[PDB]
């Protein structure tokens, strides 16, 4: 489970500073997700 404003700092960690309505707040938070698909929301 990972959503809310904590999920915004969670995407800050997985993406670092490198750079149909169901989203990451409707999946990582809804069910459960690791720091692998959480950082799939980032660029290469």
């Amino acid at each position: 489970t990972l959503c809310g404003a904590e999920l915004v700092d969670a995407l800050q960690f997985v993406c670092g500073d490198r750079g149909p309505q169901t989203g990451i707040v409707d999946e990582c938070c809804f069910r459960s997700c690791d720091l692998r698909r959480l950082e799939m929301y980032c660029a290469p």
């Binding site: 707040v25 690791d34 692998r36 660029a43």
Partner: protein, 799 residues
Amino acid sequence: EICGPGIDIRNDYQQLKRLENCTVIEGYLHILISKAEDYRSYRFPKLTTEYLLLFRVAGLESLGDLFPNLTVIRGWKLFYNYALVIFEMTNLKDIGLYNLRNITRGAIRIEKNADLSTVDWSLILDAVSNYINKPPKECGDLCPGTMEEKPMCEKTTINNEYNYCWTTNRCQKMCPSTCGKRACTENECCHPECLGSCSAPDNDTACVACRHYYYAGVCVPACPPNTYRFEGWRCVDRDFCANILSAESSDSEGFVIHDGECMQECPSGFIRNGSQSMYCIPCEGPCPKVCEEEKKTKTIDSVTSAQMLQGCTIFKGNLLINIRRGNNIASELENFMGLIEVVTGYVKRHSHALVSLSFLKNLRLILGEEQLEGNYSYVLDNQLQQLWDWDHRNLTIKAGKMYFAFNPLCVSEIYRMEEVTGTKGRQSKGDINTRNNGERASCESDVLHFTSTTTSKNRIIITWHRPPDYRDISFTVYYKAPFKNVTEYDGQDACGSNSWNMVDVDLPPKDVEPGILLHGLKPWTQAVYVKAVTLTMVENDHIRGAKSEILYIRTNASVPSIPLDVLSASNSSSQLIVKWNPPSLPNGNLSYYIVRWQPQDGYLYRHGPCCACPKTEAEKQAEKEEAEYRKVFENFLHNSIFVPRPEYPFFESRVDNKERTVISNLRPFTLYRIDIHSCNHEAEKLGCSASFVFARTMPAEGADDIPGPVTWEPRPENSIFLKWPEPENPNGLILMYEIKYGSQVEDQRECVSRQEYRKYGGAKLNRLNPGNYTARIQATSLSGNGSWTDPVFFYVQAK
């Protein structure tokens, strides 16, 4: 008049009358007799062996004149695990079971009542641990003795509760030092064979309840020869035990004597020899009950009818099968028709909801005492493949001729039973005819071999080599299988049950070989039976068909992949356990886990609980008027924003395989990117497992506190230049350096920045009074400030 198999006193107080002829109830005594009409007008001293219900008995205030002489509730059988539950009784103010001495089997449960501490239930029931009631403040528990009267009843103490009684009318008594565990009598002892009480000191024929079985007027520990221990309180002769046919609690047509007792049934693995209660024949297959149903004949054409038999073994009739409607009901019948072990007749048609009768994995054999017209004890119009899994379950039909026609089920399944089941010629060759039987389905069907088993990252490119006629296409590459215990009819499609995951790719027209792609194969597993679906007609019965072998493409699934549920946790200072889980995606056989761990930047460097006291937030739905509104904001934000986007070195360690590990020789206090990498069988060949978790090493104390003392030095403007040494390897970083100082004690306190400190070589106090003073300094580490420095008793001067 030993009452006989139990009592169900119901309707009115007029049913109590029947207890007149009840000396020992060889069963239970259930009392809704809501009639104040009578109360203590049904006294039966006679009654002196299972649960006794007491509830909804309007009028009953004490059983002192209802069941006098209650020796011991033997408690043999228990509704749940209690043998005298008095709950919500209309108006019971006293239990009044004065003679109650023991509960040989189980316990009781007296609790919340109308108007119902003294009684030592810990003596009757070894340790009261029962739900023992209506307000104990209202109890007013006072029997002769504990009241103004001088001590009359017996006294005992339990969990520090020394008291004097079942009721205020009579009282209580219990086995004294004379015996204790062994029964007892009025200060004399009881017979070797005797529990509860005896009518005369140490006498076989006086025994009131007997320790085991009061055989024909004598307490025997085991029933004499040609006599058997009635499970209750007395022992009876062989004739009585077997001649008894039914009586509510009684049911066996002759209680089949076994388990060293006249018992209704026998213990695990024992079946009544023919119709002889005398003894039981080792079954080796524990029997829940004779599975027979009132209706001699018995059919299973409904899934509810299958369930009606569930929970039993030897039926006395038959089990015809006619379930036409049903999908995957394979599991339904596995649970329902998978317990019957024997039947005295047969298992007979039109049932397309069964690929095979493997659901009956308990039916070991079939007798045949009852038969049909032309003694067919039969399959017709059922379009079944394997009968009773003959590979790992043979049966026998002692009296029954086979019949197999119009079942397009192999004829070989029954040509095998000719010898196996022993039906060599009970039936004719026209009964198990080949015409219509096994014309469809598939048996001879040739097993094709796999020409290539290419295996990428998540794609099996399984390929093969031509049916009877080449007008036949769609090459179902049915896939699914961590184990090698799988067939083809586990669950075909609808009529053949369902489990094997159907897939499909057409065979290309002579050059170009078929090559399906099971793209998206289960990561961490392999089965791939490539059956050939064709057109079965023209040749019709000569159409052989096909069924490629079940290879479990043994390439350890696919290859190395993202680990999962990793749980890194600093178990010690400069240490880091990396316990994880057999990932959800190792994609192989979990060979080892390369831990990979390594930017501490300098940003901080330069820097009803409480009755009447909280508030009413019971309007949490109104608090969710902005909280659920927060979730609406979540949709327009967490579905569209970064979806557009689609200092130190590293060190590694290949963990043997065990979930737990450790990462020692780390820095006093630093976060680590403790990545996990399940490098599997072919990681060197197909990449090493898609990379994590982070954790801060516990602070290695010593750098938390200041390593040395302080040097106070006199300075102008009543100033005092203090000093201190910098922690060598601080726990993360000494953000600030606290400084305590003051006249009597170090009253005041501040904190000099690490930067200012480095340039000052310490810190400077100011405007302190001429006279004795005292100081100190601390190191505020990233983990947390440690202890202060040694004492710094200083003194200032203005001149």
